[PDB]
């Protein structure tokens, strides 16, 4: 048996696949047998077995998601600009991050999310081999071998397992042009080496998730108010609202981001080896085949910081391009918030929104206007902009993130459970997450709260006073 070859969804085949088949099930269940309102969200499409519509096979849905990964890259920002931006960011993290002690193997092992899959090659939930303290059996071995390579600075090829995201989507993605977000399931060896190598940096960054613009690890409730307060110190506010962020990414940019992480790691030599592995053409298991994807971001959990960091680089570049001001001064005159593709940009500087949107499109990115029409707008009020699925709001007590009425109503119609074929089935039994749901409704005032409390009480089949619950969720 020789390696197969050819093309799969515009990408070169490199080998046979070891991946288990795509899930034809959803974790979502209705909360009442009643018919869903018009245009109400539902779990994403479940394949040929999906009772709701006749659409294509999941592999064909997946193949669609890979298409933009073969698309030509956009253009690199001007070298003169890349370098100054890069240097400014590196300097900024230098000045703000606390040096770390290396992450142990024990550490890296404890940090892994134990509920998700281990990926290539054992494809078993990480818990099946965990003992509260360490990995045993297969996963034990995979982890030990990977750890040995890391300490020796030896290269390992990450293998990724494609899957599609089980989530609530707007109806048009089920009944209209069918879509379902692609995920890259990293392998455990990689998860271990990445953990050891970059965990330290991820910690340092997280400790300063308020002074520095990478918001990963923040608490919306505890850190929202301070974070948005910093943003409101600046005249202009905007959100670029990217489409297909990960797929439109440049390895060239990711490598610059990766550098910064390598340079700012307690073991830069060992880190270097891991980063290069992470960024070399990616091997992606799509089921029958392992394909090679040269470009874009692998949608491995540690990459959120790398993603946020590229994001940082990209946005600073585009501004430096337009305003012709030093990245250092741009950062003096702005406040940023990045979480992967999600962003808020706040600045005093008069930004030529035309030249700015131009620049972003040229880097390969797909920013979209709030309205969706044919150049990005900017406001003098921070009220309206959103971050981490919440709407930024401001009152006499300060700023907070409020979950929108729709997301609340949507969380009432659906609950999570065991996997099943028919999302319209209701679940016998049932749920506290109903706790926090009453807290989100409080921040829309009383006359919206009573009606949410009405639906919450009637899920018995004390509901605290509005006064009481508004203060708890606002002020603690
Ligand atoms: O999957 C994608 N995009 C995607 C990515 C990759 C490829 C494709 C694709 O289809 N490519 C192609 C296919 C076929 C062909 S074809 O065969 O040729 O015809 C293509 C031909 C050509 S070409 O022209 O011929 O070259 C080119 C391409 S290309 O690749 O597109 O270039 C093709 C599409 N999006 C996606 C999917 C699923 C869920 C969600 C999702 O995010 N749900 C949500 C979750 C959470 C929140 S929340 O947390 O904020 O509440 C959400 C809030 C809101 S909000 O409240 O309204 O703001 C809304 C949603 S939403 O998504 O429900 O909208 C939310 C998003």
Short mmCIF file of C-alpha atoms and ligand atoms in Angstrom, two decimals:
data_model
loop_
_atom_site.label_atom_id
_atom_site.label_comp_id
_atom_site.label_asym_id
_atom_site.label_seq_id
_atom_site.Cartn_x
_atom_site.Cartn_y
_atom_site.Cartn_z
CA UNK A 1 0.00 0.00 0.00
CA UNK A 2 1.49 3.32 -1.17
CA UNK A 3 0.27 6.75 0.05
CA UNK A 4 -2.70 7.86 -2.02
CA UNK A 5 -2.56 11.11 -4.00
CA UNK A 6 -4.77 13.58 -5.74
CA UNK A 7 -7.04 16.44 -4.83
CA UNK A 8 -9.75 16.78 -2.23
CA UNK A 9 -11.80 19.99 -2.16
CA UNK A 10 -9.01 21.84 -4.01
CA UNK A 11 -6.39 20.61 -1.53
CA UNK A 12 -3.66 18.00 -2.08
CA UNK A 13 -4.21 14.50 -0.60
CA UNK A 14 -1.26 13.35 1.48
CA UNK A 15 -2.50 10.13 3.07
CA UNK A 16 -5.41 7.95 4.16
CA UNK A 17 -7.61 9.16 7.01
CA UNK A 18 -8.10 7.68 10.48
CA UNK A 19 -10.93 10.02 11.48
CA UNK A 20 -14.28 8.71 12.73
CA UNK A 21 -17.35 9.71 10.72
CA UNK A 22 -18.95 13.15 11.10
CA UNK A 23 -21.69 13.41 13.74
CA UNK A 24 -25.24 13.26 12.44
CA UNK A 25 -26.49 14.29 15.88
CA UNK A 26 -27.13 17.44 17.97
CA UNK A 27 -26.83 18.10 21.69
CA UNK A 28 -29.73 20.56 21.57
CA UNK A 29 -33.27 19.74 22.67
CA UNK A 30 -36.41 21.87 22.79
CA UNK A 31 -37.79 22.93 26.17
CA UNK A 32 -41.46 22.67 25.18
CA UNK A 33 -43.26 20.71 22.43
CA UNK A 34 -44.80 23.97 21.14
CA UNK A 35 -44.09 25.08 17.53
CA UNK A 36 -41.12 27.39 17.13
CA UNK A 37 -41.81 31.04 16.31
CA UNK A 38 -41.19 32.13 12.67
CA UNK A 39 -37.48 32.45 11.73
CA UNK A 40 -36.36 31.00 15.08
CA UNK A 41 -32.85 29.49 15.38
CA UNK A 42 -32.30 25.75 15.32
CA UNK A 43 -29.29 23.38 15.61
CA UNK A 44 -27.10 23.26 12.51
CA UNK A 45 -27.80 20.77 9.70
CA UNK A 46 -27.31 17.09 10.53
CA UNK A 47 -26.67 15.44 7.16
CA UNK A 48 -28.58 13.07 4.87
CA UNK A 49 -30.45 11.67 7.93
CA UNK A 50 -31.72 15.18 8.88
CA UNK A 51 -35.52 14.99 9.03
CA UNK A 52 -35.92 18.80 8.50
CA UNK A 53 -34.50 19.10 4.93
CA UNK A 54 -33.00 17.23 2.00
CA UNK A 55 -29.54 18.71 1.54
CA UNK A 56 -26.07 17.29 0.70
CA UNK A 57 -23.92 14.87 2.72
CA UNK A 58 -21.91 16.33 5.63
CA UNK A 59 -18.60 15.57 3.89
CA UNK A 60 -19.89 17.70 1.04
CA UNK A 61 -20.84 20.41 3.57
CA UNK A 62 -17.35 20.10 5.04
CA UNK A 63 -15.75 20.25 1.57
CA UNK A 64 -17.52 23.63 1.10
CA UNK A 65 -15.96 24.94 4.31
CA UNK A 66 -12.44 24.04 3.03
CA UNK A 67 -12.85 25.93 -0.25
CA UNK A 68 -11.52 29.31 0.99
CA UNK A 69 -8.43 27.50 2.30
CA UNK A 70 -7.21 27.09 -1.27
CA UNK A 71 -8.16 30.70 -2.12
CA UNK A 72 -5.18 33.00 -2.92
CA UNK A 73 -3.81 34.89 0.10
CA UNK A 74 -4.29 38.64 0.34
CA UNK A 75 -1.23 40.87 0.51
CA UNK A 76 1.34 41.23 3.22
CA UNK A 77 1.38 44.68 4.87
CA UNK A 78 4.36 46.83 3.79
CA UNK A 79 7.55 45.46 5.32
CA UNK A 80 8.46 48.91 6.70
CA UNK A 81 5.13 48.87 8.56
CA UNK A 82 5.05 45.19 9.59
CA UNK A 83 8.38 45.52 11.36
CA UNK A 84 7.65 48.68 13.38
CA UNK A 85 4.24 47.31 14.40
CA UNK A 86 5.81 43.98 15.34
CA UNK A 87 8.50 45.72 17.37
CA UNK A 88 5.99 47.92 19.14
CA UNK A 89 3.81 45.01 20.17
CA UNK A 90 6.85 43.01 21.29
CA UNK A 91 8.09 45.98 23.30
CA UNK A 92 4.59 46.45 24.83
CA UNK A 93 4.39 42.82 26.00
CA UNK A 94 8.01 43.02 27.23
CA UNK A 95 7.05 45.98 29.45
CA UNK A 96 3.83 44.41 30.70
CA UNK A 97 4.26 40.64 31.03
CA UNK A 98 5.71 38.95 34.11
CA UNK A 99 8.50 36.44 33.22
CA UNK A 100 7.41 32.84 33.88
CA UNK A 101 8.81 29.53 35.12
CA UNK A 102 8.53 26.72 32.52
CA UNK A 103 5.36 24.67 32.44
CA UNK A 104 5.88 21.13 33.66
CA UNK A 105 4.50 18.03 31.97
CA UNK A 106 2.15 17.59 34.93
CA UNK A 107 0.94 21.17 34.34
CA UNK A 108 0.28 20.69 30.61
CA UNK A 109 -1.57 17.48 31.35
CA UNK A 110 -3.85 19.13 33.94
CA UNK A 111 -4.59 22.11 31.63
CA UNK A 112 -6.17 20.01 28.87
CA UNK A 113 -9.97 20.07 28.56
CA UNK A 114 -10.78 16.51 29.56
CA UNK A 115 -14.30 16.41 28.06
CA UNK A 116 -13.25 16.81 24.42
CA UNK A 117 -11.62 14.21 22.11
CA UNK A 118 -7.92 13.33 22.08
CA UNK A 119 -7.90 13.30 18.24
CA UNK A 120 -5.30 11.41 16.17
CA UNK A 121 -4.86 8.61 16.64
CA UNK A 122 -6.98 7.24 19.49
CA UNK A 123 -10.05 9.52 19.05
CA UNK A 124 -11.31 8.88 22.59
CA UNK A 125 -12.52 11.43 25.11
CA UNK A 126 -9.44 12.55 27.13
CA UNK A 127 -11.25 11.49 30.33
CA UNK A 128 -11.26 7.77 29.36
CA UNK A 129 -7.52 7.73 30.25
CA UNK A 130 -7.34 10.40 33.00
CA UNK A 131 -6.98 9.63 36.73
CA UNK A 132 -7.43 13.05 38.33
CA UNK A 133 -3.64 13.37 38.20
CA UNK A 134 -2.23 11.84 34.97
CA UNK A 135 -2.91 10.11 31.67
CA UNK A 136 -2.72 6.35 31.60
CA UNK A 137 -2.98 3.72 28.85
CA UNK A 138 -2.90 4.90 25.24
CA UNK A 139 -3.25 8.59 26.00
CA UNK A 140 -0.58 8.07 28.70
CA UNK A 141 1.80 6.79 26.01
CA UNK A 142 0.91 9.45 23.43
CA UNK A 143 1.56 12.12 26.05
CA UNK A 144 4.85 10.62 27.25
CA UNK A 145 6.25 10.26 23.75
CA UNK A 146 5.21 13.86 22.83
CA UNK A 147 6.74 15.21 26.02
CA UNK A 148 10.05 13.47 25.19
CA UNK A 149 10.16 15.15 21.78
CA UNK A 150 9.54 18.55 23.35
CA UNK A 151 12.40 18.28 25.85
CA UNK A 152 14.74 17.06 23.07
CA UNK A 153 13.72 19.86 20.65
CA UNK A 154 12.64 17.26 18.04
CA UNK A 155 9.95 17.94 15.46
CA UNK A 156 6.55 16.25 15.34
CA UNK A 157 3.89 16.66 12.64
CA UNK A 158 0.53 17.75 14.14
CA UNK A 159 -2.40 15.85 12.64
CA UNK A 160 -5.78 17.59 12.75
CA UNK A 161 -9.21 15.95 12.70
CA UNK A 162 -11.86 17.88 10.82
CA UNK A 163 -15.28 18.16 12.36
CA UNK A 164 -18.36 20.37 11.94
CA UNK A 165 -19.79 22.59 14.72
CA UNK A 166 -22.99 21.54 16.43
CA UNK A 167 -24.59 24.91 17.23
CA UNK A 168 -27.71 27.06 16.92
CA UNK A 169 -27.84 28.89 13.57
CA UNK A 170 -30.14 31.33 11.77
CA UNK A 171 -32.82 29.28 9.88
CA UNK A 172 -31.44 30.28 6.45
CA UNK A 173 -28.37 28.09 7.13
CA UNK A 174 -30.60 25.02 7.49
CA UNK A 175 -33.30 25.67 4.92
CA UNK A 176 -31.53 28.05 2.54
CA UNK A 177 -27.87 27.66 1.50
CA UNK A 178 -26.74 25.04 4.01
CA UNK A 179 -23.60 25.78 6.10
CA UNK A 180 -21.90 24.45 9.24
CA UNK A 181 -18.67 25.74 10.80
CA UNK A 182 -15.57 23.58 10.37
CA UNK A 183 -13.43 22.79 13.42
CA UNK A 184 -9.85 21.44 13.58
CA UNK A 185 -9.44 18.81 16.29
CA UNK A 186 -5.80 18.90 17.28
CA UNK A 187 -4.05 15.70 18.41
CA UNK A 188 -3.01 15.15 22.03
CA UNK A 189 0.74 15.08 21.36
CA UNK A 190 0.46 18.53 19.81
CA UNK A 191 -1.89 19.64 22.62
CA UNK A 192 0.81 18.61 25.09
CA UNK A 193 3.78 20.21 23.33
CA UNK A 194 1.80 23.43 22.69
CA UNK A 195 0.65 23.46 26.30
CA UNK A 196 4.21 23.15 27.70
CA UNK A 197 5.69 25.57 25.20
CA UNK A 198 3.09 28.39 25.28
CA UNK A 199 1.09 27.86 28.47
CA UNK A 200 3.54 30.12 30.35
CA UNK A 201 3.03 32.94 27.82
CA UNK A 202 -0.77 32.30 27.85
CA UNK A 203 -0.65 32.76 31.67
CA UNK A 204 1.39 35.98 31.56
CA UNK A 205 -0.91 37.40 28.91
CA UNK A 206 -4.00 36.36 30.88
CA UNK A 207 -2.80 38.12 34.07
CA UNK A 208 -2.80 41.39 32.12
CA UNK A 209 -5.98 40.78 30.06
CA UNK A 210 -6.95 44.38 31.01
CA UNK A 211 -3.85 46.55 30.40
CA UNK A 212 -3.06 44.66 27.19
CA UNK A 213 -5.59 44.22 24.35
CA UNK A 214 -5.69 40.43 24.25
CA UNK A 215 -8.91 39.81 26.18
CA UNK A 216 -8.67 35.99 26.36
CA UNK A 217 -9.45 34.80 29.91
CA UNK A 218 -11.42 37.91 30.89
CA UNK A 219 -14.63 37.71 32.93
CA UNK A 220 -17.37 39.73 31.27
CA UNK A 221 -18.89 40.58 34.64
CA UNK A 222 -15.81 41.37 36.67
CA UNK A 223 -13.61 42.77 33.88
CA UNK A 224 -16.21 44.10 31.44
CA UNK A 225 -16.73 47.34 33.38
CA UNK A 226 -13.02 48.20 33.63
CA UNK A 227 -12.29 47.15 30.04
CA UNK A 228 -15.11 49.17 28.48
CA UNK A 229 -14.23 52.11 30.77
CA UNK A 230 -10.77 52.17 29.18
CA UNK A 231 -12.39 52.08 25.70
CA UNK A 232 -14.71 55.02 26.48
CA UNK A 233 -11.62 57.20 27.19
CA UNK A 234 -11.22 57.55 23.38
CA UNK A 235 -13.24 59.55 20.80
CA UNK A 236 -13.95 57.05 18.02
CA UNK A 237 -15.14 53.45 18.29
CA UNK A 238 -15.52 50.65 15.68
CA UNK A 239 -15.91 46.91 15.06
CA UNK A 240 -14.70 45.53 11.74
CA UNK A 241 -17.00 42.44 11.94
CA UNK A 242 -14.90 39.92 9.97
CA UNK A 243 -16.29 37.13 7.81
CA UNK A 244 -14.23 33.87 7.58
CA UNK A 245 -11.38 35.19 9.69
CA UNK A 246 -9.50 31.94 10.12
CA UNK A 247 -9.64 30.87 6.50
CA UNK A 248 -8.44 34.26 5.20
CA UNK A 249 -5.36 34.27 7.43
CA UNK A 250 -1.79 34.44 6.20
CA UNK A 251 0.82 32.03 7.52
CA UNK A 252 3.24 34.94 6.95
CA UNK A 253 1.35 36.98 9.53
CA UNK A 254 0.90 33.99 11.87
CA UNK A 255 4.65 33.37 11.73
CA UNK A 256 5.27 36.98 12.89
CA UNK A 257 2.78 36.44 15.71
CA UNK A 258 4.39 33.08 16.46
CA UNK A 259 7.81 34.74 16.69
CA UNK A 260 6.59 37.10 19.39
CA UNK A 261 5.25 34.17 21.39
CA UNK A 262 8.48 32.22 20.92
CA UNK A 263 10.66 35.19 21.93
CA UNK A 264 8.51 35.80 25.01
CA UNK A 265 8.48 32.19 26.25
CA UNK A 266 10.56 30.91 29.16
CA UNK A 267 12.05 28.17 26.89
CA UNK A 268 12.39 29.90 23.47
CA UNK A 269 14.42 27.07 21.86
CA UNK A 270 11.91 24.37 22.72
CA UNK A 271 9.09 26.77 21.88
CA UNK A 272 10.64 27.51 18.47
CA UNK A 273 10.40 23.85 17.46
CA UNK A 274 6.72 23.72 18.48
CA UNK A 275 5.76 26.94 16.69
CA UNK A 276 7.39 25.82 13.43
CA UNK A 277 5.43 22.54 13.70
CA UNK A 278 2.23 24.46 14.33
CA UNK A 279 2.77 26.67 11.27
CA UNK A 280 4.15 24.21 8.69
CA UNK A 281 1.62 23.04 6.09
CA UNK A 282 -1.17 21.50 8.13
CA UNK A 283 -2.16 17.83 7.85
CA UNK A 284 -5.97 17.64 8.07
CA UNK A 285 -7.87 14.35 8.47
CA UNK A 286 -11.22 14.71 6.62
CA UNK A 287 -12.22 11.09 7.07
CA UNK A 288 -11.11 8.98 4.13
CA UNK A 289 -8.02 11.09 3.62
CA UNK A 290 -5.44 13.28 5.30
CA UNK A 291 -4.98 16.46 3.21
CA UNK A 292 -2.31 19.20 3.39
CA UNK A 293 -3.47 22.73 4.01
CA UNK A 294 -0.69 25.26 3.35
CA UNK A 295 -2.57 28.42 4.41
CA UNK A 296 -5.08 29.96 6.81
CA UNK A 297 -5.41 29.46 10.56
CA UNK A 298 -6.15 25.93 11.93
CA UNK A 299 -9.60 26.68 13.55
CA UNK A 300 -5.84 23.54 18.53
CA UNK A 301 -7.18 25.62 21.53
CA UNK A 302 -3.89 27.54 22.21
CA UNK A 303 -4.21 29.30 18.83
CA UNK A 304 -6.69 31.83 20.21
CA UNK A 305 -3.81 33.90 21.52
CA UNK A 306 -1.87 33.46 18.29
CA UNK A 307 -5.06 34.38 16.49
CA UNK A 308 -5.64 37.47 18.70
CA UNK A 309 -1.99 38.42 18.16
CA UNK A 310 -2.11 38.26 14.36
CA UNK A 311 -5.36 40.25 14.73
CA UNK A 312 -3.44 42.83 16.81
CA UNK A 313 -0.69 42.97 14.14
CA UNK A 314 -3.16 43.31 11.27
CA UNK A 315 -5.23 46.10 12.85
CA UNK A 316 -2.20 48.08 14.00
CA UNK A 317 -0.68 47.80 10.49
CA UNK A 318 -3.82 49.08 8.71
CA UNK A 319 -4.00 52.05 11.08
CA UNK A 320 -0.27 52.82 10.83
CA UNK A 321 -0.69 52.63 7.04
CA UNK A 322 -3.57 55.11 7.00
CA UNK A 323 -2.65 57.66 9.73
CA UNK A 324 1.09 57.48 8.92
CA UNK A 325 1.67 57.61 12.69
CA UNK A 326 4.12 55.38 14.65
CA UNK A 327 2.51 52.17 16.03
CA UNK A 328 3.66 53.38 19.44
CA UNK A 329 1.74 56.63 19.12
CA UNK A 330 -1.24 54.77 17.62
CA UNK A 331 -1.32 52.64 20.79
CA UNK A 332 -0.98 55.79 22.91
CA UNK A 333 -4.08 57.13 21.15
CA UNK A 334 -6.16 53.93 21.08
CA UNK A 335 -7.57 51.09 23.10
CA UNK A 336 -8.02 47.64 21.55
CA UNK A 337 -9.88 44.46 22.44
CA UNK A 338 -9.22 41.23 20.60
CA UNK A 339 -10.53 37.75 21.14
CA UNK A 340 -9.67 35.68 18.10
CA UNK A 341 -11.64 37.35 15.34
CA UNK A 342 -13.72 39.46 17.74
CA UNK A 343 -12.66 43.08 18.19
CA UNK A 344 -13.40 46.55 19.48
CA UNK A 345 -11.15 49.36 18.28
CA UNK A 346 -11.12 52.71 20.07
CA UNK A 347 -9.03 55.66 19.05
CA UNK A 348 -8.67 59.41 19.14
CA UNK A 349 -7.07 59.47 15.67
CA UNK A 350 -9.11 60.64 12.67
CA UNK A 351 -9.17 57.40 10.67
CA UNK A 352 -9.78 57.59 6.94
CA UNK A 353 -12.35 54.79 7.07
CA UNK A 354 -12.10 54.36 3.28
CA UNK A 355 -8.29 53.92 3.23
CA UNK A 356 -8.67 51.73 6.36
CA UNK A 357 -11.31 49.33 4.93
CA UNK A 358 -9.30 49.31 1.70
CA UNK A 359 -6.21 48.16 3.61
CA UNK A 360 -8.02 45.44 5.55
CA UNK A 361 -9.47 43.97 2.33
CA UNK A 362 -6.03 44.01 0.77
CA UNK A 363 -4.55 42.01 3.64
CA UNK A 364 -7.05 39.32 2.59
CA UNK A 365 -9.63 40.06 5.29
CA UNK A 366 -13.40 40.29 4.84
CA UNK A 367 -14.72 43.11 7.05
CA UNK A 368 -18.46 43.76 6.74
CA UNK A 369 -20.54 46.89 7.41
CA UNK A 370 -23.05 46.77 10.30
CA UNK A 371 -25.85 47.03 7.70
CA UNK A 372 -24.10 44.68 5.16
CA UNK A 373 -24.28 47.18 2.24
CA UNK A 374 -21.36 48.20 -0.02
CA UNK A 375 -16.48 51.24 3.77
CA UNK A 376 -16.66 50.58 7.55
CA UNK A 377 -18.37 53.24 9.68
CA UNK A 378 -17.15 54.58 13.02
CA UNK A 379 -19.06 56.14 15.93
CA UNK A 380 -18.49 58.76 18.64
CA UNK A 381 -20.44 56.58 21.08
CA UNK A 382 -19.22 53.25 22.43
CA UNK A 383 -22.82 52.25 23.16
CA UNK A 384 -23.90 49.82 20.43
CA UNK A 385 -20.66 47.98 19.74
CA UNK A 386 -20.52 44.35 20.86
CA UNK A 387 -17.82 42.12 22.31
CA UNK A 388 -17.95 38.41 23.25
CA UNK A 389 -21.59 37.94 22.13
CA UNK A 390 -22.69 40.67 24.57
CA UNK A 391 -23.80 44.24 23.87
CA UNK A 392 -21.69 46.96 25.54
CA UNK A 393 -23.99 49.17 27.64
CA UNK A 394 -23.42 52.25 29.80
CA UNK A 395 -25.38 53.74 32.69
CA UNK A 396 -24.79 55.89 35.77
CA UNK A 397 -22.86 53.01 37.43
CA UNK A 398 -20.63 52.39 34.44
CA UNK A 399 -20.25 49.98 31.56
CA UNK A 400 -21.33 46.37 31.19
CA UNK A 401 -21.89 43.66 28.62
CA UNK A 402 -25.52 42.69 28.32
CA UNK A 403 -26.71 39.57 26.49
CA UNK A 404 -29.33 40.59 23.91
CA UNK A 405 -33.04 39.80 24.22
CA UNK A 406 -32.80 37.33 21.33
CA UNK A 407 -29.95 35.30 22.86
CA UNK A 408 -31.94 35.11 26.07
CA UNK A 409 -35.13 33.96 24.32
CA UNK A 410 -33.05 31.50 22.27
CA UNK A 411 -31.49 30.01 25.44
CA UNK A 412 -35.00 29.45 26.77
CA UNK A 413 -36.17 27.43 23.79
CA UNK A 414 -33.16 25.09 23.81
CA UNK A 415 -31.20 23.15 26.39
CA UNK A 416 -28.15 20.88 26.14
CA UNK A 417 -28.35 17.11 26.53
CA UNK A 418 -27.20 13.76 25.16
CA UNK A 419 -26.77 13.56 21.39
CA UNK A 420 -29.88 12.73 19.37
CA UNK A 421 -31.18 12.77 15.80
CA UNK A 422 -34.24 15.04 16.20
CA UNK A 423 -33.67 18.52 17.66
CA UNK A 424 -37.43 19.04 18.10
CA UNK A 425 -37.76 16.23 20.69
CA UNK A 426 -38.09 17.61 24.19
CA UNK A 427 -35.90 16.14 26.90
CA UNK A 428 -37.48 14.27 29.80
CA UNK A 429 -36.15 15.39 33.24
CA UNK A 430 -34.11 18.66 33.18
CA UNK A 431 -31.39 22.93 34.90
CA UNK A 432 -28.93 24.85 37.15
CA UNK A 433 -27.47 27.86 33.81
CA UNK A 434 -31.08 28.99 34.37
CA UNK A 435 -29.56 30.97 37.26
CA UNK A 436 -27.47 33.26 35.00
CA UNK A 437 -30.34 33.58 32.52
CA UNK A 438 -32.51 35.40 35.02
CA UNK A 439 -29.47 37.66 35.69
CA UNK A 440 -29.13 38.64 32.03
CA UNK A 441 -32.83 39.54 31.79
CA UNK A 442 -32.60 41.80 34.85
CA UNK A 443 -30.34 44.22 32.95
CA UNK A 444 -33.11 44.87 30.41
CA UNK A 445 -35.33 46.34 33.17
CA UNK A 446 -38.39 45.03 35.06
CA UNK A 447 -41.11 44.69 32.37
CA UNK A 448 -38.79 42.41 30.40
CA UNK A 449 -37.65 40.67 33.58
CA UNK A 450 -41.14 39.72 34.84
CA UNK A 451 -41.91 38.07 31.46
CA UNK A 452 -38.61 36.15 31.50
CA UNK A 453 -39.21 35.19 35.15
CA UNK A 454 -42.66 34.09 33.95
CA UNK A 455 -41.06 31.58 31.51
CA UNK A 456 -38.44 30.61 34.14
CA UNK A 457 -40.95 29.84 36.94
CA UNK A 458 -43.14 27.88 34.49
CA UNK A 459 -40.11 25.63 33.89
CA UNK A 460 -40.83 23.97 37.29
CA UNK A 461 -42.80 21.43 35.20
CA UNK A 462 -37.81 31.60 44.94
CA UNK A 463 -37.64 33.54 41.70
CA UNK A 464 -35.85 36.51 43.35
CA UNK A 465 -37.16 40.08 43.07
CA UNK A 466 -35.89 42.11 40.11
CA UNK A 467 -34.29 44.60 42.56
CA UNK A 468 -32.35 41.78 44.28
CA UNK A 469 -31.12 40.11 41.09
CA UNK A 470 -30.12 43.31 39.24
CA UNK A 471 -27.68 44.28 42.03
CA UNK A 472 -26.18 40.79 42.35
CA UNK A 473 -25.36 40.54 38.63
CA UNK A 474 -24.26 44.18 38.29
CA UNK A 475 -22.31 44.75 41.48
CA UNK A 476 -21.78 41.28 43.03
O1 LIG B 1 -19.99 28.57 7.52
C1 LIG B 1 -20.00 29.81 7.51
N1 LIG B 1 -19.35 30.51 6.56
C2 LIG B 1 -18.66 29.87 5.61
C3 LIG B 1 -17.33 29.52 5.85
C4 LIG B 1 -16.60 28.86 4.88
C5 LIG B 1 -17.18 28.57 3.65
C6 LIG B 1 -18.50 28.94 3.39
C7 LIG B 1 -19.07 28.62 2.16
O2 LIG B 1 -20.27 28.35 2.08
N2 LIG B 1 -18.24 28.59 1.10
C8 LIG B 1 -18.79 28.20 -0.05
C9 LIG B 1 -19.70 27.15 -0.04
C10 LIG B 1 -20.28 26.72 -1.23
C11 LIG B 1 -19.93 27.32 -2.43
S1 LIG B 1 -20.68 26.75 -3.95
O3 LIG B 1 -20.80 25.22 -3.91
O4 LIG B 1 -19.80 27.15 -5.14
O5 LIG B 1 -22.07 27.37 -4.08
C12 LIG B 1 -19.00 28.37 -2.44
C13 LIG B 1 -18.67 28.95 -3.66
C14 LIG B 1 -17.76 30.00 -3.72
S2 LIG B 1 -17.37 30.73 -5.32
O6 LIG B 1 -17.94 32.14 -5.41
O7 LIG B 1 -18.00 29.85 -6.41
O8 LIG B 1 -15.85 30.78 -5.55
C15 LIG B 1 -17.17 30.46 -2.54
C16 LIG B 1 -17.49 29.87 -1.32
S3 LIG B 1 -16.72 30.50 0.13
O9 LIG B 1 -16.09 29.36 0.94
O10 LIG B 1 -17.79 31.19 0.97
O11 LIG B 1 -15.66 31.52 -0.27
C17 LIG B 1 -18.42 28.82 -1.26
C18 LIG B 1 -19.24 29.58 4.38
N3 LIG B 1 -20.66 30.54 8.44
C19 LIG B 1 -21.35 29.97 9.43
C20 LIG B 1 -21.80 28.65 9.36
C21 LIG B 1 -22.53 28.12 10.42
C22 LIG B 1 -22.82 28.88 11.56
C23 LIG B 1 -22.39 30.20 11.62
C24 LIG B 1 -22.62 31.01 12.72
O12 LIG B 1 -21.72 31.78 13.04
N4 LIG B 1 -23.81 30.97 13.38
C25 LIG B 1 -23.82 31.79 14.45
C26 LIG B 1 -23.23 31.36 15.63
C27 LIG B 1 -23.19 32.20 16.74
C28 LIG B 1 -23.72 33.49 16.67
S4 LIG B 1 -23.65 34.58 18.13
O13 LIG B 1 -22.73 34.01 19.22
O14 LIG B 1 -23.10 35.94 17.68
O15 LIG B 1 -25.06 34.77 18.70
C29 LIG B 1 -24.29 33.93 15.47
C30 LIG B 1 -24.82 35.23 15.39
C31 LIG B 1 -25.41 35.70 14.22
S5 LIG B 1 -26.09 37.40 14.15
O16 LIG B 1 -26.89 37.69 15.43
O17 LIG B 1 -27.05 37.58 12.97
O18 LIG B 1 -24.93 38.39 14.03
C32 LIG B 1 -25.45 34.86 13.10
C33 LIG B 1 -24.92 33.57 13.17
S6 LIG B 1 -25.00 32.56 11.79
O19 LIG B 1 -23.73 31.72 11.66
O20 LIG B 1 -26.22 31.64 11.95
O21 LIG B 1 -25.17 33.43 10.54
C34 LIG B 1 -24.34 33.09 14.35
C35 LIG B 1 -21.65 30.72 10.56
#
